[PDB]
Amino acid sequence: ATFEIVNRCSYTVWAAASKGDAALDAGGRQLNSGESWTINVEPGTNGGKIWARTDCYFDDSGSGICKTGDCGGLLRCKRFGRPPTTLAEFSLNQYGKDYIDISNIKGFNVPMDFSPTTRGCRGVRCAADIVGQCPAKLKAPGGGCNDACTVFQTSEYCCTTGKCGPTEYSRFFKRLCPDAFSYVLDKPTTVTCPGSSNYRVTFCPTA
């Protein structure tokens, strides 16, 4: 499957793509404002994620740091990124269908649209100004709006036992972005697409 990753933000981002134990395609790349990078993701990929990283520095070997979304200091991510990270999440070719969502469970750094470029389903978007509106206790000094699990490390926020409810913090993310997951047991906002759809992830889709 192809995923065109487009940076419509006014700032550079370093796109990242991983399934947690491996890179997807090259795993990461710089995208200056306006650039587009198309990756290929193997059919059947389960638990894939794409995200933006901000304010990164890499040396000539691809090693460095980002303030949001760092994946073990690599340009080419093999592993998921450090919160806060708005997440485009997908599982492809799962019993004949693809499944996509956006999640704020690991916080928010950059606004996002995640849409099919092929027939048969709708996109999802979280493009509100969550960083600007972030509750004071969730603001990341490093940049972005942390989720409450990251900040407070409680069973309730992290849904450790599987029985957690919404919270004042999850409700903030849900108010700003109804169409993204705000906590682990949120009412799902997953979209079912035809198996082997192709997609576009756009950072800063609006404004």
> DSSP of the chain, one letter per residue?
-EEEEEE-SSS-EEEEEE-SSSEEEEEEEEE-TT-EEEEE--TT--SEEEEEEBS-EE-TTSBEE-SBS--TTBSS-SSPPPSS--EEEEEEEETTEEEEEEE-TT-BSS-EEEEESSSS---EEE-S-HHHH--GGGB-TTSSB--HHHHH--HHHHTTTS-----HHHHHHHHH-TTSB-STTSPP--EEEETT--EEEEES---
Q: What angle do CA 111, 116, 119 make, to 5 degrees?
A: 155
CATH number of the CATH domain containing 140: 2.60.110.10
- What are the φ/ψ torsions at residue 170 (nearest 5 degrees)? -60, -40
183: left (phi over 0), alpha (psi -120 to 50) or beta: beta
| Residue 174 domain boundaries | 1-207
- What resolution in angstroms, rounded to 1 decimal? 1.1
CA dihedral in degrees (93, 99, 102, 105; nearest 10)? -90
Q: Using CB atoms within 10 A of its CB, is residue 127 exposed (0-12), middle (13-18) or buried (19+)?
A: buried
Distance CA(197)–CA(173), nearest Å, equals 28
- What are the φ/ψ torsions at residue 168 (nearest 5 degrees)? -60, -40
Sign of the four-CA dihedral 47, 52, 56, 61: positive
How many separate domains does the chain show?
A: 1
CB 102 within 8 A of CB 179: yes
Neighbours of 96 (CB within 10 A): 8
Among 128, 124, 123, which Cα is nearest to 110's?
A: 128
